[PDB]
Design a protein around this motif. Structure first.
Motif, PDB file in Angstrom:
ATOM      1  N   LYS A  84     -67.927 -11.792-133.594  1.00  0.00           N
ATOM      2  CA  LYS A  84     -68.955 -12.811-133.777  1.00  0.00           C
ATOM      3  C   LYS A  84     -70.264 -12.255-134.365  1.00  0.00           C
ATOM      4  O   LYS A  84     -70.791 -11.205-133.956  1.00  0.00           O
ATOM      5  CB  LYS A  84     -69.246 -13.527-132.450  1.00  0.00           C
ATOM      6  N   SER A  97     -61.078 -20.735-129.943  1.00  0.00           N
ATOM      7  CA  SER A  97     -61.179 -20.046-128.657  1.00  0.00           C
ATOM      8  C   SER A  97     -62.162 -20.511-127.629  1.00  0.00           C
ATOM      9  O   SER A  97     -62.096 -20.005-126.486  1.00  0.00           O
ATOM     10  CB  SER A  97     -61.536 -18.575-128.906  1.00  0.00           C
ATOM     11  N   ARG A  98     -63.118 -21.374-127.981  1.00  0.00           N
ATOM     12  CA  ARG A  98     -64.203 -21.693-127.028  1.00  0.00           C
ATOM     13  C   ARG A  98     -65.151 -20.496-126.923  1.00  0.00           C
ATOM     14  O   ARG A  98     -66.337 -20.621-127.229  1.00  0.00           O
ATOM     15  CB  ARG A  98     -63.643 -22.076-125.657  1.00  0.00           C
ATOM     16  N   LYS A  99     -64.606 -19.336-126.543  1.00  0.00           N
ATOM     17  CA  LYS A  99     -65.286 -18.047-126.716  1.00  0.00           C
ATOM     18  C   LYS A  99     -65.753 -17.900-128.166  1.00  0.00           C
ATOM     19  O   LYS A  99     -66.940 -17.666-128.411  1.00  0.00           O
ATOM     20  CB  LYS A  99     -64.381 -16.871-126.317  1.00  0.00           C
ATOM     21  N   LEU A 134     -75.699 -17.318-121.429  1.00  0.00           N
ATOM     22  CA  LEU A 134     -74.292 -17.648-121.670  1.00  0.00           C
ATOM     23  C   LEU A 134     -73.979 -19.148-121.581  1.00  0.00           C
ATOM     24  O   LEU A 134     -74.349 -19.830-120.621  1.00  0.00           O
ATOM     25  CB  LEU A 134     -73.426 -16.905-120.662  1.00  0.00           C
ATOM     26  N   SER A 143     -67.386 -20.658-115.910  1.00  0.00           N
ATOM     27  CA  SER A 143     -67.693 -19.256-115.663  1.00  0.00           C
ATOM     28  C   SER A 143     -68.824 -19.077-114.655  1.00  0.00           C
ATOM     29  O   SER A 143     -69.799 -19.818-114.638  1.00  0.00           O
ATOM     30  CB  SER A 143     -68.078 -18.552-116.961  1.00  0.00           C
ATOM     31  N   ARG A 161     -70.756 -21.327-121.178  1.00  0.00           N
ATOM     32  CA  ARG A 161     -69.332 -21.192-120.861  1.00  0.00           C
ATOM     33  C   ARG A 161     -69.032 -21.908-119.543  1.00  0.00           C
ATOM     34  O   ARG A 161     -68.933 -21.264-118.494  1.00  0.00           O
ATOM     35  CB  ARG A 161     -68.955 -19.708-120.784  1.00  0.00           C
ATOM     36  N   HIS A 197     -71.970 -19.023-116.445  1.00  0.00           N
ATOM     37  CA  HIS A 197     -72.523 -20.190-117.092  1.00  0.00           C
ATOM     38  C   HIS A 197     -74.029 -20.255-116.868  1.00  0.00           C
ATOM     39  O   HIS A 197     -74.492 -20.141-115.738  1.00  0.00           O
ATOM     40  CB  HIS A 197     -71.874 -21.457-116.575  1.00  0.00           C
ATOM     41  N   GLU A 229     -75.566  -7.693-123.731  1.00  0.00           N
ATOM     42  CA  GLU A 229     -74.432  -7.390-124.577  1.00  0.00           C
ATOM     43  C   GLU A 229     -74.810  -6.312-125.615  1.00  0.00           C
ATOM     44  O   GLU A 229     -75.921  -6.316-126.172  1.00  0.00           O
ATOM     45  CB  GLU A 229     -73.926  -8.681-125.243  1.00  0.00           C
ATOM     46  N   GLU A 251     -68.558 -20.843-129.410  1.00  0.00           N
ATOM     47  CA  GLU A 251     -69.847 -20.814-128.694  1.00  0.00           C
ATOM     48  C   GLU A 251     -70.963 -20.460-129.669  1.00  0.00           C
ATOM     49  O   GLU A 251     -70.802 -19.585-130.520  1.00  0.00           O
ATOM     50  CB  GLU A 251     -69.846 -19.831-127.512  1.00  0.00           C
TER      51      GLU A 251
END
Ligand code: MG
Ligand code: MG
Ligand code: MG
Ligand code: MG
Ligand code: MG
Ligand code: MG
Ligand code: MG
Ligand code: MG
Ligand code: MG
Ligand code: MG
Ligand code: MG
Ligand code: MG
Ligand code: MG
Ligand code: MG
Ligand code: MG
Ligand code: MG
Ligand code: MG
Ligand code: MG
Ligand code: MG
Ligand code: MG
Ligand code: MG
Ligand code: MG
Ligand code: MG
Ligand code: MG
Ligand code: MG
Ligand code: MG
Ligand code: MG
Ligand code: MG
Ligand code: MG
Ligand code: MG
Ligand code: MG
Ligand code: MG
Ligand code: MG
Ligand code: MG
Ligand code: MG
Ligand code: MG
Ligand code: MG
Ligand code: MG
Ligand code: MG
Ligand code: MG
Ligand code: MG
Ligand code: MG
Ligand code: MG
Ligand code: MG
Ligand code: MG
Ligand code: MG
Ligand code: MG
Ligand code: MG
Ligand code: MG
Ligand code: MG
Ligand code: MG
Ligand code: MG
Ligand code: MG
Ligand code: MG
Ligand code: MG
Ligand code: MG
Ligand code: MG
Ligand code: MG
Ligand code: MG
Ligand code: MG
Ligand code: MG
Ligand code: MG
Ligand code: MG
Ligand code: MG
Ligand code: MG
Ligand code: MG
Ligand code: MG
Ligand code: MG
Ligand code: MG
Ligand code: MG
Ligand code: MG
Ligand code: MG
Lengths: 386, 63, 109, 183
Positions: free
Chosen positions: A280, A346-348, A59, A64, A61, A67, A73, A351
């Motif tokens: 995504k 969103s950054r999300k 990840l 978080s 982020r 991170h 997932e 990514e």
RNA sequence: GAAAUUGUUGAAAGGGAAGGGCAUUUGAUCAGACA
RNA sequence: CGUGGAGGUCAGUGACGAAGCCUAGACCGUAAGGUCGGGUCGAACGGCCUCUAGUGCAGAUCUUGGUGGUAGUAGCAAAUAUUCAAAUGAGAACUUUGAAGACUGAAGUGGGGAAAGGUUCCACGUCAACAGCAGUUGGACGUGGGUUAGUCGAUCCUAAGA
RNA sequence: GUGAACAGCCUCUAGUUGAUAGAAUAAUGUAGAUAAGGGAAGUCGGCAAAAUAGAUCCGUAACUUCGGGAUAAGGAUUGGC
């Protein structure tokens, strides 16, 4: 008299009526805004949903607590062989809204589409487009002027494509045909693109890429006649109640003396249109690539197809789109992937993922093994074998 | 054709329950004429009607 | 036209009986077989040999074997002329195991 | 005799009846109507198919809460059924009409069913016992069935009136002038 | 051999009842009176 | 204005068709009603003066009879369970025989009786009704046959009581 | 036969195999079951349900009309050879 206690209603009045959809192929109600400065490209794509599997990736982020840590997932895989362009349709603006004024078609049409135009292929004379096809003979005259006509007018151009369902493990021969709006260049550049691509073929990579946020338009699974509890998420009436208990006790006050549109009632569940957004892309796979399901970090030569193959589907021998999580519709159903209607910041979203591992063990039970090789390594020689 | 009577008659004559009188399906025309116990007696004596064995209840697992 | 053939098939009773209520399982098998005969021989007239009945019920209502080896015989019809000139007779075949055989023609003499 | 209204050359027709038949009056009404005016030979093959569940009988009056079937599409209908006992009584009378036609020396190739009418025989009474000591009627609804088969005959020629024309002084003068003028 | 009620045939009307009043169009039908 | 009966009268109508019934045909009356034609029908009937009353219906949760929509609808789902083939028959998911699968499980779905019924027993024939599918089957329908005692009961005795 | 047993369950003799049928398996039911974590927070109320159970051994309180309370409570054990 006034509820007693307040609670949110059950379910969303903006997804009514809860009827079966008019077609298996959910409609694209909207295309991305057009920016005629970019090159001409499709704005969506057909495929068939194959199945799901699991992924592992680090990840990215900041801030978080995960991170720089691996996460697992869920992801879906939709079979995605090249699409083939067979026509162009030109729309014009009116005070009554968008109207189509002509459709121009390729000269040769695969039996795959032709089949779509029929309800009893085997018995039929298959005469579809056989006079249209002759229009090309005369130097091109009447085809140019329809093309000409689209250019002169036309506020928007959509192209007519269909799926190569034969490159798919499905049994249903009859392909899927659809309009995808073209969005690069000038209107005239669009139809030039279109004419150029007749009978020719187009690939997901020409339309999607890694880490892109896409949407999925599809008809939801079917469940037939459903009572109120499970269809609306209504509270089971108490065990003592007579005349049954998966119900609504009060179907309305005394006035209005009519049952209202806004109370829950038994009826069809599923087989709905949905437009699900922001999925995504985790992989844009290529059919002609062993190590499809392999990774920078994995390295083992293997494709995405699980041991024993996708349950209730088959094998994937075409390009695919691997999408984080889940999507409306079931295994085998046609599915429109669409370009996002907004640039999400969103950054999300943004990514950039990099898969470290794709699960590939059987889904037909508790899969213990990724490959036949791994499974041989562990079990040793059996009573068959060598 | 209706051998119900001759079957009851058979049971009574042999000394056995109807569940065990065998009325032979290829002599149905002859059996049907047997209205009397005398004619069933002849029909039993020559194998047109047979007693049919008891169902065993072995005691070997008991033993 | 006619044709008059005998072959020996193995029918998968197991996937045809999957789910069926316990007190209909041996009854379904009779119908299922009949249906299996018509699909191969094209014939609406299917008679089962009494022995085939026994084979089917050999273990009571709900205990049908997963695989029967059948012999099916398309025959012409006689007397009070039926709707169709043909009919099938199905028989059990005494085989050690109905596991592993493929469909097979039986030479007529 | 004395059948219902017919409009038909009795010299070219034959006919049949069953009175007091223990078939459902409503079901055999719908199946009679399914046949009304049919080429005799077409109709017979049709009833045979009903019995085979290959085509159905459209239920157009006595039909509420009946089921639905694809086999009503050809009649533009969603509710249709397959009344065995009805069909067999009708084809019974039908086969009779045939015989009577053969007897009269009528061409069996031209036969269409030109009249077919069922109505209600007297009901037959039976009873059922209901909760709390009560009795209810449990009744048959028998039917009278009658039909007529007729040789189909083509054409009709013309011939009728001549419409006696009556027009005033000012009306026959314009006419006299129309010719005096032109052609 | 009435009526309720029913089948067939023929004619007509029917965008959440039907039926009714005054008036006329249109269709069908018919008495009288002319000499 | 209309109805059943009565006195008178019209020497009234009528088997060459009385009465009755039908008829988005005609005509008279403000109306109660009256008159005609046509069809159906079959033995009797009407005008006028007058006499007489069991004399006029939309209703009464009216009386008796008949009939609808409801509706080919509710339903025909307790008691574990049925299957193959032959035979018979116009006709067979349902009858008969063979086979098979089961059940009751001797606190019986076995073998007999008391009370009650009264021929249901048995045989031959046999399906219009009846057995809320069916029917070639039946406790149904038709026609017959069948109940043997010194010792089994009654009869005798006494009981509460009559 | 199992077993304390005229229990339940399986069986021999006898007797049945009668209860409209076919096709599917939507909702809601009726009747039969199961549920992670929690454990009466549900409800007027634990209604319904679940838990307990046979036998052998161990071990059993207040109180009492000295008879009881008591299978109190609480434990262990149990097949085949
Ligand atoms: Mg409030
Ligand atoms: Mg639709
Ligand atoms: Mg144009
Ligand atoms: Mg549900
Ligand atoms: Mg919920
Ligand atoms: Mg949900
Ligand atoms: Mg209650
Ligand atoms: Mg509720
Ligand atoms: Mg799985
Ligand atoms: Mg199941
Ligand atoms: Mg009559
Ligand atoms: Mg109606
Ligand atoms: Mg109706
Ligand atoms: Mg219905
Ligand atoms: Mg309705
Ligand atoms: Mg309809
Ligand atoms: Mg009842
Ligand atoms: Mg009573
Ligand atoms: Mg004139
Ligand atoms: Mg002029
Ligand atoms: Mg009469
Ligand atoms: Mg009017
Ligand atoms: Mg008017
Ligand atoms: Mg008067
Ligand atoms: Mg009077
Ligand atoms: Mg009187
Ligand atoms: Mg008269
Ligand atoms: Mg009238
Ligand atoms: Mg007049
Ligand atoms: Mg007259
Ligand atoms: Mg007379
Ligand atoms: Mg007077
Ligand atoms: Mg009075
Ligand atoms: Mg009144
Ligand atoms: Mg009245
Ligand atoms: Mg009233
Ligand atoms: Mg009044
Ligand atoms: Mg009344
Ligand atoms: Mg009444
Ligand atoms: Mg009916
Ligand atoms: Mg029903
Ligand atoms: Mg019920
Ligand atoms: Mg049966
Ligand atoms: Mg048992
Ligand atoms: Mg017992
Ligand atoms: Mg009994
Ligand atoms: Mg006795
Ligand atoms: Mg009696
Ligand atoms: Mg008897
Ligand atoms: Mg009968
Ligand atoms: Mg009776
Ligand atoms: Mg009956
Ligand atoms: Mg009957
Ligand atoms: Mg008798
Ligand atoms: Mg007698
Ligand atoms: Mg004595
Ligand atoms: Mg004496
Ligand atoms: Mg008995
Ligand atoms: Mg019943
Ligand atoms: Mg039952
Ligand atoms: Mg059923
Ligand atoms: Mg729980
Ligand atoms: Mg606890
Ligand atoms: Mg509480
Ligand atoms: Mg507590
Ligand atoms: Mg509370
Ligand atoms: Mg309380
Ligand atoms: Mg409280
Ligand atoms: Mg309780
Ligand atoms: Mg538990
Ligand atoms: Mg205590
Ligand atoms: Mg031990």
């Amino acid at each position: 008299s006034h509820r007693k206690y307040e609670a949110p209603r059950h379910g969303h009045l903006g997804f009514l009526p809860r009827k079966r959809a008019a077609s298996i192929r959910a409609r694209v109600k909207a295309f991305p805004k057009d920016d005629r400065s970019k090159p001409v490209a499709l704005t969506s794509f057909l495929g068939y949903k194959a199945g799901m599997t699991t992924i592992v990736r680090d990840l990215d982020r900041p801030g978080s607590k995960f991170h720089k840590r691996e996460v697992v997932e869920a992801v879906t895989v939709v079979d995605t062989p090249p699409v083939v362009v067979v026509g162009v349709v030109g729309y014009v603006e009116t005070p009554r809204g968008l109207r189509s004024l002509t459709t121009v078609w390729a000269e040769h049409l695969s039996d795959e589409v032709k089949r779509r135009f029929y309800k009893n292929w085997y018995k039929s004379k298959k005469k579809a487009f056989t006079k249209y096809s002759a229009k090309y003979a005369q130097d091109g005259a009447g085809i140019e002027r329809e093309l000409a006509r689209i250019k002169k007018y036309a506020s928007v151009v959509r192209v007519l494509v269909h799926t190569q369902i034969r490159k798919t493990p499905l049994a249903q021969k009859k392909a899927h045909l659809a309009e995808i709006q073209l969005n690069g260049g000038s209107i005239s550049e669009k139809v030039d693109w279109a004419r150029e691509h007749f009978e020719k073929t187009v690939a997901v990579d020409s339309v999607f890429e890694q880490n892109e946020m896409i949407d999925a338009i599809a008809v939801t699974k079917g469940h037939g006649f459903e009572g109120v509890t499970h269809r609306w998420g209504t509270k089971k009436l108490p065990r003592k109640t007579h005349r049954g208990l998966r119900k609504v006790a009060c179907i309305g006050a005394w006035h209005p003396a009519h049952v209202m549109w806004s109370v829950a009632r038994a009826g069809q569940r599923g087989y709905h249109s949905r437009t699900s957004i922001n999925h995504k892309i985790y992989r844009v796979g290529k059919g002609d690539d062993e190590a499809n399901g392999a990774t920078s970090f994995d390295r083992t030569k293997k494709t995405i197809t699980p041991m024993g193959g996708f349950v209730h589907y088959g094998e994937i021998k075409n390009d695919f789109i691997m999408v984080k999580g889940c999507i409306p519709g079931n295994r085998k159903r046609i599915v429109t992937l669409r370009k996002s209607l907004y640039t999400n910041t969103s950054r999300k979203a943004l990514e950039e993922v990099s898969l470290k591992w794709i699960d590939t063990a059987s889904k037909f039970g508790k899969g213990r093994f990724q490959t036949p090789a791994e499974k041989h390594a562990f079990m040793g020689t059996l009573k068959k074998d060598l | 054709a209706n051998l119900r009577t001759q079957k009851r008659l058979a049971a009574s004559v042999v000394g056995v329950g109807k569940r065990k009188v065998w009325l032979d399906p290829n002599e149905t025309s002859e059996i049907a004429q047997a209205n009397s116990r005398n004619a069933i007696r002849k029909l039993v004596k020559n194998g047109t009607i047979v007693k049919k064995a008891v169902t065993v209840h072995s005691k070997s697992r008991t033993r | 036209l006619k044709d008059v053939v005998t072959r020996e098939y193995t029918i998968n009773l197991h996937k045809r009986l999957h789910g069926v209520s316990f007190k209909k399982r041996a009854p379904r098998a009779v119908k299922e077989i009949k249906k299996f005969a018509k699909l191969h021989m094209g014939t609406d007239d299917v008679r089962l040999a009494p022995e085939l009945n026994q084979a089917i019920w050999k273990r009571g209502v709900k205990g049908v074997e997963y695989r029967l080896r059948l012999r099916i015989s398309r025959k012409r019809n006689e007397e009070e002329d039926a709707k169709n000139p043909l009919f099938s007779y199905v028989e059990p075949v005494l085989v050690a195991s109905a596991k592993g055989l493929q469909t097979v023609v039986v030479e007529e003499d | 005799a004395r059948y219902g209204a017919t409009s038909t050359n009795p010299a070219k027709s034959a006919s049949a009846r069953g009175s007091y038949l223990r078939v459902s009056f409503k079901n055999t009404r719908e199946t009679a109507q399914a046949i009304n005016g049919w080429e005799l030979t077409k109709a017979q093959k049709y009833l045979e198919q009903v019995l085979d569940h290959q085509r159905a009988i459209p239920f157009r009056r006595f039909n509420s809460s009946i089921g639905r079937t694809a086999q009503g599409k050809e009649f533009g209908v969603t509710k249709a059924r397959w009344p065995a006992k009805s069909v067999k009584f009708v084809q019974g009378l039908l086969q009779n009409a045939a015989a009577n036609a053969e007897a009269k020396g009528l061409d069996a190739t031209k036969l269409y069913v030109s009249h077919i009418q069922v109505n209600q025989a007297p009901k037959q009474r039976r009873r059922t016992y209901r909760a709390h000591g009560r009795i209810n009627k449990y009744e048959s609804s028998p039917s009278h069935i009658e039909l007529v088969v007729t040789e189909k005959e083509e054409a009709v020629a013309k011939a009728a009136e001549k419409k006696v024309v009556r027009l005033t002084s000012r009306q026959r003068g314009r006419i006299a002038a129309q010719k005096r003028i032109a052609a």
